Design a binder for this molecule. Structure first.
Ligand SMILES: O=C(Nc1cncc2c1CNCC2)[C@@H]1CCOc2ccc(Cl)cc21
Ligand SMILES: O=C(Nc1cncc2c1CNCC2)[C@@H]1CCOc2ccc(Cl)cc21
Ligand SMILES: [Cl-]
Lengths: 301, 305
């Protein structure tokens, strides 16, 4: 019993974190096999950040301009290339702690663990979700760039996020490990803003199923709803539309608890209307949206 | 910016988790140097649990009755002894991944990271606090016994918790690594219950300072209070008393934000007496008490391990 915001054990990723320095800028890199991945903005000064021409700035760098530190050992950079917004530094030593890994680009609503790092040293681990507006509500300070997000279903680390920037509202933007940003963000200090965010409906439903599995039923009701009427109500509270894919994904949890997906949608509609009336659900006074249906099944089973 | 419930990086602990089997029971063990630590109830059948005589049950076991698996490698048990509610299995191989470590017993209100494990394999990491009623609000399923809680102080892992039991309300009970239970619990299948819990006041104040550091100030007010008047309110709302030690510990956060501890107490007093009025603090509609003052400073200043 119990339901916590749970991160994957970070050990496999901790053994990949390195410090990357270029000039006066220091951030984190991810060392996998003989390559260190890091944000390409490590080659910029604060001045270069408004309209950097990364191809032009990079062509001027030599391998010895990149200082990579793995623990108390300097790694020798022997090549470099840019892939989208990520810099790939070829080093002369393969990371002996390289886990079984893959690069995966996630969709909004998906969750992952973040291993926040500073100076190539891990500081903490926490659980995030890719918001519908393509930002993450992380906890990152200056020096955290290059920290990564990942999942470890099985013993294979699926890297899905590399941290690049903090937006004015204090939320975070980054790329997948191929250097493609999530959302319409650019690695420039030009005016950028997070779009209006919405609640991840399918995840709230998953968390309500987690609450039912854990013995909480106070929010259930005798009603059901059509998917279209649910979406008309959902959107008035800034909830994401629930698609037939989301209804299908919730199938297993629905079968396990005996509560049809559209029956749980009717509970959610009532919670949006009424609030919790001084009650909590799984220790929360707000509807939680950073647990996916997959997370709920993994944690409760 | 941002403020998350953050656990310590678990790698140093992951390299210590092993699977311990005794008869039909499989649970987790902690392998440090040449010893595997695990709950002494691993030797009990469900019937033994009703009223166990652990010394009597243990004397009947041989070293070969304990099967210890570290990854895909079987460790050889060469001795066994009990220390309070923990079983210590001497193995013939020292764990080469043994980190710098200590065994520490924490106080209620202290937070720690839990590495939940099943079959000697780490499954997840989460942060929690030792409640004032000595339980933890964990997330544990069957097979999770022997999972451990820890903190990291510089390069040293301080192991503070080993999981043993789930109480009827779904909260958890365990021991320190010397096998002493936190709370008035016993490792026996007999009627036990979590006592009435209270809120960890010093931690709520620390989290209010974290909210201020992160740009949330709506709850601040022009008022201050005395420590005695604050404690009279805190007692009324099932909050733990705030001591001068707690006030001293909050000193740094008080100096950084410009909000004196008793000035923040006046904000808390008003929050208790009037609620949040539809507002949230750091994305929460409840006052969060599972961040210590040290956790707040560590997260808002970026300490690494
Ligand atoms: O945001 C950035 N880094 C950073 C990362 N995470 C947390 C925080 C910060 C900044 N200070 C608050 C906390 C840098 C700074 C300049 O502006 C840009 C613009 C574009 C890019 Cl790709 C990166 C950056
Ligand atoms: O509580 C126990 N273990 C367990 C551990 N964590 C989570 C869960 C469980 C049980 N099923 C729900 C989830 C065992 C079961 C029998 O009763 C006792 C009695 C005493 C002791 Cl020390 C241990 C136990
Ligand atoms: Cl995805």
């Amino acid at each position: 019993s119990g339901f916590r915001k749970m991160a994957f054990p970070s050990g496999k990723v901790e053994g990949c974190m390195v410090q990357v320095t270029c000039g006066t800028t220091t951030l984190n890199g991810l060392w996998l096999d003989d390559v260190v991945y890091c944000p390409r903005h490590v080659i910029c000064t604060s001045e270069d950040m408004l309209n950097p021409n990364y191809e032009d700035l990079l062509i001027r760098k030599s391998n010895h301009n990149f200082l990579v530190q793995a623990g108390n050992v300097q790694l020798r950079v022997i090549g470099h290339s840019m892939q989208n917004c990520v810099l790939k530094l070829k080093v002369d030593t393969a990371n002996p702690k390289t886990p079984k890994y893959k690069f995966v680009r996630i969709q909004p609503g998906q969750t992952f663990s973040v291993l926040a790092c500073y100076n190539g040293s891990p500081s903490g681990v926490y659980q995030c979700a890719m918001r519908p507006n393509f930002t993450i509500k992380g906890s990152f300070l200056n020096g955290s760039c290059g920290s990564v997000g990942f999942n470890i279903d099985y013993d294979c680390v699926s890297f899905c996020y590399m941290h690049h920037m903090e937006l004015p509202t204090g939320v975070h933007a980054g790329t997948d490990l191929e250097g493609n940003f999530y959302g319409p963000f650019v690695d420039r200090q030009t005016a950028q803003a997070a779009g209006t965010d919405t609640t991840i409906t399918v995840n709230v439903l998953a968390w309500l199923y987690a609450a039912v599995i854990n013995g909480d039923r106070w929010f259930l009701n005798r009603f059901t709803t059509t998917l279209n009427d649910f979406n008309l109500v959902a959107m008035k509270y800034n909830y994401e539309p629930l698609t037939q894919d989301h209804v299908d994904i919730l199938g297993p949890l629905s079968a396990q608890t005996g509560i049809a997906v559209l029956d749980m949608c009717a509970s959610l509609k009532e919670l949006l209307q009424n609030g919790m009336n001084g009650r909590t659900i799984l220790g929360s006074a707000l509807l939680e949206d950073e647990f996916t249906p997959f997370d709920v099944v993994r944690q409760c089973s």
